[PDB]
Design an enzyme around this catalytic site. Structure first.
Site, PDB file in Angstrom:
ATOM      1  N   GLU A 133       0.862  -1.175   0.000  1.00  0.00           N
ATOM      2  CA  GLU A 133       0.000   0.000   0.000  1.00  0.00           C
ATOM      3  C   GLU A 133       0.900   1.226   0.000  1.00  0.00           C
ATOM      4  O   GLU A 133       1.750   1.374   0.884  1.00  0.00           O
ATOM      5  CB  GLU A 133      -0.944   0.006   1.204  1.00  0.00           C
ATOM      6  CG  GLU A 133      -2.064  -1.023   1.113  1.00  0.00           C
ATOM      7  CD  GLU A 133      -2.926  -0.847  -0.128  1.00  0.00           C
ATOM      8  OE1 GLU A 133      -3.117   0.308  -0.566  1.00  0.00           O
ATOM      9  OE2 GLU A 133      -3.410  -1.863  -0.669  1.00  0.00           O
ATOM     10  N   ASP A 156      -4.720  10.838   8.606  1.00  0.00           N
ATOM     11  CA  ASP A 156      -3.463  10.288   9.091  1.00  0.00           C
ATOM     12  C   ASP A 156      -3.052  10.952  10.398  1.00  0.00           C
ATOM     13  O   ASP A 156      -3.255  12.154  10.587  1.00  0.00           O
ATOM     14  CB  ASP A 156      -2.353  10.461   8.050  1.00  0.00           C
ATOM     15  CG  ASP A 156      -2.476   9.481   6.901  1.00  0.00           C
ATOM     16  OD1 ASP A 156      -2.511   8.262   7.168  1.00  0.00           O
ATOM     17  OD2 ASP A 156      -2.542   9.924   5.736  1.00  0.00           O
ATOM     18  N   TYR A 191     -10.983  -3.176   2.795  1.00  0.00           N
ATOM     19  CA  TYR A 191     -10.218  -2.581   3.889  1.00  0.00           C
ATOM     20  C   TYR A 191     -11.069  -2.651   5.149  1.00  0.00           C
ATOM     21  O   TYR A 191     -12.007  -1.871   5.326  1.00  0.00           O
ATOM     22  CB  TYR A 191      -9.819  -1.143   3.568  1.00  0.00           C
ATOM     23  CG  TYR A 191      -8.718  -0.607   4.464  1.00  0.00           C
ATOM     24  CD1 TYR A 191      -8.953  -0.350   5.811  1.00  0.00           C
ATOM     25  CD2 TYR A 191      -7.445  -0.362   3.965  1.00  0.00           C
ATOM     26  CE1 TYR A 191      -7.952   0.131   6.634  1.00  0.00           C
ATOM     27  CE2 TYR A 191      -6.439   0.123   4.779  1.00  0.00           C
ATOM     28  CZ  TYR A 191      -6.697   0.365   6.114  1.00  0.00           C
ATOM     29  OH  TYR A 191      -5.703   0.848   6.932  1.00  0.00           O
TER      30      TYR A 191
HETATM   31  O1  LIG Z   1      -0.868   3.552  10.282  1.00  0.00           O
HETATM   32  P1  LIG Z   1      -1.857   2.460  10.625  1.00  0.00           P
HETATM   33  O2  LIG Z   1      -2.483   2.722  11.975  1.00  0.00           O
HETATM   34  O3  LIG Z   1      -1.142   1.129  10.603  1.00  0.00           O
HETATM   35  O4  LIG Z   1      -2.990   2.447   9.489  1.00  0.00           O
HETATM   36  C1  LIG Z   1      -2.712   1.827   8.257  1.00  0.00           C
HETATM   37  C2  LIG Z   1      -2.503   2.938   7.236  1.00  0.00           C
HETATM   38  O5  LIG Z   1      -1.238   3.520   7.459  1.00  0.00           O
HETATM   39  C3  LIG Z   1      -2.559   2.357   5.829  1.00  0.00           C
HETATM   40  O6  LIG Z   1      -3.883   1.940   5.567  1.00  0.00           O
END
Ligand SMILES: O=P(O)(O)OC[C@@H](O)CO
Ligand SMILES: *Cc1c(COP(=O)(O)O)cnc(C)c1O
Ligand SMILES: *Cc1c(COP(=O)(O)O)cnc(C)c1O
Ligand SMILES: N[C@@H](Cc1c[nH]c2ccccc12)C(=O)O
Ligand SMILES: N[C@@H](Cc1c[nH]c2ccccc12)C(=O)O
Ligand SMILES: O=P(O)(O)OC[C@@H](O)CO
Ligand code: NA
Ligand code: NA
EC number: 4.2.1.20
Lengths: 396, 267, 396, 267
Positions: free
Chosen positions: B48, B59, B174
């Site tokens: 990803e 984020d 997801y």
């Molecule tokens: O950072 P985390 O908490 O692992 O979340 C996953 C994300 O970074 C990608 O889908």
């Protein structure tokens, strides 16, 4: 599925992470329910009248327009409790939060006025208020930060990104995505994801509703045009809303021109930006060629926002409203002119709307026109900014 | 087709998938390419990959800083697609999924974005700030260019959302561990067994659990709960942030973590 | 000979140099004539409603009084244009000046609020405004000086004497004694020589008149007491006036206690001064044992005046009104409390009146009492003074 | 009785009166006593003496500073009355008039003030901020202690005010030259002939013109216009302020000015 159309033409929508969609659905339903609840409207009216000071005056400025055929009225949102129009919708949103059983309030702010407005509404109605504010804006707005904390709000500086309004907008949505069961996001303008553009408009539309009844009582007819500054779009749509179906009334929104459109240092995404998707909406935005959200600029912090509400983009698209820009120097001139000739210190935000009205009058002085400018706030907060500029230019 | 082949081979081995996440160009283009080759060599089943965005509103601080470092390196979306083309040419079988924000997909046209994804060999696109309710033009453009549209199943999903994610999702589902934003310090505290079986009942794409997955026991718990695998982002990015001063130690610690997380996917 | 009694009991009078007596006689006659002129009242009402924002709200503070049997209302003069009650009477006096054919305005100011109020009234009504201000106050009040000059007024620093309010009062009377044929002296409180205590009261009595009608509509009865701060006496007498013949309604004036009455650093001449003759009136005054006018003190500049209006001394003398004092720390506590629990930033002036109301409530929490505090102004102007005090004390 | 004797002797000499004004204790007690002895020795017919007050609202900058200097010397009203007692003991015939502000007269009681004036030999009291309309208790206390109450005839006086000033005034009538406050730089620009004859018709006390009188030709013009004399204040105080650094030159210039002003009173 929603109860109301999330789009104004092609603009708007609900572009939030999937986790936040139940929070938006709950908010839309509670809003639709509140709008039909006379107990909610009575409590809202009670707060607007007996706490905020509604209705606000509609002042005729006769000295301003001397020598021309323009009659100018000012809708006096500067007399509203808090000194700005923002107080209207934060009282409504705080009641919505209590209607949903929420006890905490999340708010973003840049200039600090919505932070102050959110803090006073939360203190009054027993809500815990936390405010996200870009670290650059925390330093620029020390007085407003102190006002928020005087009224018990928690002010959280945001150091991520460019550390300003759009970065505080991100952090509020980050917070809300993990707390919406107990906290409500008191968004600060008629922008963002549905239903916020609709809610803020309906919680500000008393501006235009009062203006209509007042102008009919004093002049016997509707205005030829109403003029309002557009930073996010809430004070403008609040003035515009009740006149939208009156097709003879012009609707004029004024975006900040900054140092000049050609300089790139402005805040006029509706006329000089590009449509993108950010902050939960599809709307005109100031952005790089690659799609990174650009930084806007204005002498007026309250108009410093890289985007604009979706209903304004739609009203422009169909030609129902026209949108122009006013530079820093034009707003500064309108600021000084209103002080000297009417004894009213306008907000530098509202000075942009007044500056265009003065331009309409001066460019065509023999045109008979009845104009209403939405004086969205008072300018006592701006006297230090105005002082240092006039001092640096040797004018004082 | 790469996801369907991966999940079939993993099912033959009684295995789950470990899918790390990194932001492209963090901390630099060259080191990021070396980071990604280390993840695959250490046992990553799929990737990803995020494109640096100015306002990553989904984020937490760890990936906020990842976008900041890549901004400090001057990484552009056009440079990211040149990386994707090289990564696909280096690894022809591993599924490559993009984690995008809507403006970068909308900027040069929605169709042109997914056409560019097809040219470079991307297998799926997840757009973080486009819910299922707004996903129509995005998933149509994805499918027109053989891109799998990725949808989120949040922990509070009702039955209507379960059917839509199952009916419109491709490649993988997801499975969100928790509310909030990304971050290894915060772990999901809701058993997702009922959502996993409901997704299987509705013939959804295989579920990958993400958000908060930072330890081997979480990968094993996700596989044991019925999910096809687990996604780990902030835990990977923290190793990058921790070893920014030592690029060699950065790759060494990334290999140890990914190898340990992948070994936890063996049932 | 005068048309009206220049005295309230033994207090008041017209103690000006002989040269100024025709100016006072002309002012009294023009006032008496204006009070009978419906055209004057309509113009005054038009300015108060459509420019200043009258009527002001009467806000019920429910969070403030929780746990007690006190019901507290705030008369919201903080929402008046300019942010203080002073705007009421300066609009009336400016109309009186135009009634007499005067084109120039003289004003004294200390805190700067009356200077701002005089400047905005003069700018609106086409009057040339010159403002005398003690040089010490010019330095303390840089923001208000800029507001005055923004609205076209001339601010003249006074370096004579102690270079503060009483010295600016002298210079305004010196100027007026050589210019009263063309300039009117817009005195800033309900004090000085007759007819100024009477004129300012009648131009502020709408505060109490509105409060009475509003409290009767909301509670069905008159208040048990109305409470107002007393610096010169204008906002207090404006609240008191319409209740004077309602003998069941208590009248409570709050003088600044400063650092404490026993410290000598206060501004409470009515209860702790001595009757003298200065500023054109016989009234309680803070003075030395030899008769030199003493300097008063308060954290609130608007209450920093060594004397008091003669009608308050008379009302106290006959026991119709009671007068108390509130220290700096008590006013500061009331300031912070209203911010936190009602979302209203009060003027440090008005904080003195609120502090006594909080004292009446807290000392006797089971006493059933309906109280109205005159919130004479907003406190945004005071946040820097409050900040530095809390910062120096380590509270922030 | 001293004013009536002075005006009779001056009338026998076809002469007007020159009456200088100084603030008591300016710039110090000793120098002020020496100043006053110099004024008399140079030909002053009578004295007008001010007691330092914190707020002299009828005085311009020159006498404002005179009150400030005497404040800097710590001159109190009690010290002023000790000076007055010594001045009266030094000069038994010259009329001594006080120019007061109301608070200093009211402070220790109105009656006690004029009783103190009688004890020290003061001949008249003018209270600058008490008009005729407020003068009742002040003039009663003055007359009870053989003090002449001084009233002002302003240039805009109507007939009613002329009769009151004539009916209640004693010693002399203060004929105001102009509006405004004290100051030698500003001179009265209205012929006061009609007011002078009206005061004589109503048997008013002899008129002394004050405010702005700073030159010999003004003293002569006042006497020629029918007034019994002229009062000069700021012109005297400016000589004090000019020569604060040289007390000896201060007395020398005061003598030259007063002698020139007195010579102008000879008709
Ligand atoms: O950072 P985390 O908490 O692992 O979340 C996953 C994300 O970074 C990608 O889908
Ligand atoms: C905040 C503000 C604005 C800008 O907000 P909008 O949503 O665009 O109305 C304009 N005027 C004033 C006084 C403001 O405080
Ligand atoms: C100036 C002021 C006062 C003091 O004036 P008063 O004549 O005593 O009323 C009190 N409150 C406010 C807000 C003021 O501006
Ligand atoms: N910047 C102003 C108004 C504002 C608040 N939130 C916004 C969001 C978008 C645009 C403007 C705003 C303030 O913080 O008071
Ligand atoms: N000091 C305050 C109020 C004021 C004006 N003039 C006064 C005279 C006396 C007492 C108070 C005042 C101001 O200047 O705004
Ligand atoms: O100062 P002038 O203008 O001379 O006025 C006289 C005054 O000082 C005494 O009566
Ligand atoms: Na904008
Ligand atoms: Na006082």
């Amino acid at each position: 599925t929603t109860l109301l159309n999330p789009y104004f033409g092609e603009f708007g929508g609900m572009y939030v992470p999937q986790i936040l969609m139940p929070a938006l659905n709950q908010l839309e339903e509670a809003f639709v329910s509140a709008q039909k609840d006379p107990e909610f409207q009575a409590q809202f009216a009670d707060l607007l009248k007996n706490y905020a000071g509604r209705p606000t005056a509609l002042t005729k400025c006769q000295n301003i327009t001397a020598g021309t055929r323009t009659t100018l009225y000012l809708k006096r949102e500067d007399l509203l409790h808090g000194g700005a129009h923002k107080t209207n919708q934060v009282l409504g949103q705080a009641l919505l939060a209590k209607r949903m059983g929420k006890s905490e309030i999340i708010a973003e702010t840049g200039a600090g006025q919505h932070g102050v407005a959110s803090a006073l509404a939360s203190a009054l109605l027993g809500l815990k208020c936390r405010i996200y504010m870009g670290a650059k804006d925390v330093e620029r707005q020390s007085p407003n930060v102190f006002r928020m904390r005087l009224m018990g709000a928690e002010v959280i500086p945001v150091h991520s990104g460019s550390a300003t309004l759009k970065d505080a907008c991100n952090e509020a949505l980050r917070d809300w995505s993990g707390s919406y069961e107990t906290a409500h996001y008191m968004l600060g303008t008629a922008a963002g994801p549905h239903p916020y553009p609709t809610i803020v408009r309906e919680f500000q539309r008393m501006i235009g509703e009062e203006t209509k009844a007042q102008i009919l009582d004093k002049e016997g007819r509707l205005p030829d045009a109403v003029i309002a500054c557009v930073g996010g779009g809430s004070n403008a749509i609040g003035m515009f809303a009740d006149f939208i179906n009156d097709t003879s009334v012009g609707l004029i929104g004024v975006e900040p021109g900054g140092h000049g459109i050609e300089t790139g240092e402005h805040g006029a995404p509706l006329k000089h930006g590009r449509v993108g998707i950010y902050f939960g909406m599809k709307a005109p935005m100031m952005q790089t060629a690659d799609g990174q959200i650009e930084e806007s600029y204005s002498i007026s912090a309250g108009l410093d926002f890289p985007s604009v509400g979706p209903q304004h983009a739609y009203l422009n698209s169909i030609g129902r409203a026209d949108y122009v820009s006013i530079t820093d120097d034009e707003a500064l001139e309108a600021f000084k002119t209103l002080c000297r000739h009417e004894g009213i210190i306008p907000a530098l935000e509202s000075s942009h709307a007044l500056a265009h009205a003065l331009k309409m009058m001066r460019e065509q002085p023999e045109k008979e026109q009845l104009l209403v400018v939405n004086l969205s706030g008072r300018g006592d907060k701006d006297i230090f900014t105005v002082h240092d500029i006039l001092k640096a230019r040797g004018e004082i | 087709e790469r996801y369907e082949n991966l999940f079939a081979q993993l099912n033959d081995r009684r295995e789950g998938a470990f899918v790390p996440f990194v932001t492209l160009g963090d901390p630099g283009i060259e080191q990021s390419l070396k980071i990604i080759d280390t993840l695959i060599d250490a046992g990553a089943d799929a990737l990803e990959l995020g494109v640096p965005f100015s306002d990553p509103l989904a984020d937490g601080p760890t990936i906020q800083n990842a976008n900041l470092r890549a901004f400090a390196a001057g990484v552009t979306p056009a440079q990211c697609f040149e990386m994707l083309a090289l990564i696909r040419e280096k690894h022809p079988t591993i599924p490559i999924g993009l984690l995008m924000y809507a403006n970068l997909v909308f900027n040069n046209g929605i169709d042109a974005f997914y056409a560019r994804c097809e040219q470079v060999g991307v297998d799926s696109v997840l757009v973080a700030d486009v819910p299922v309710e707004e996903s129509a033009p995005f998933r149509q453009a994805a499918l027109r260019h053989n891109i799998a549209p990725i949808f989120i199943c949040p922990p509070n999903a009702d039955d209507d959302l379960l059917r839509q994610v199952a009916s419109y999702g491709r490649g993988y589902t997801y499975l969100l561990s928790r509310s909030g934003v990304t971050g290894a310090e915060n772990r999901g505290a809701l058993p997702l067994h009922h959502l996993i079986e409901k997704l299987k009942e509705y013939h959804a794409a295989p579920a990958l659990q993400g958000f908060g997955i930072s330890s081997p026991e979480q990968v094993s718990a996700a596989v044991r709960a019925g999910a096809a695998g687990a996604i780990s982002g902030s835990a990977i990015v923290k190793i990058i942030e921790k070893n920014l001063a030592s690029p060699k130690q950065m790759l060494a610690e990334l290999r140890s973590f990914v190898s340990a997380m992948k070994a936890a996917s063996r049932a």
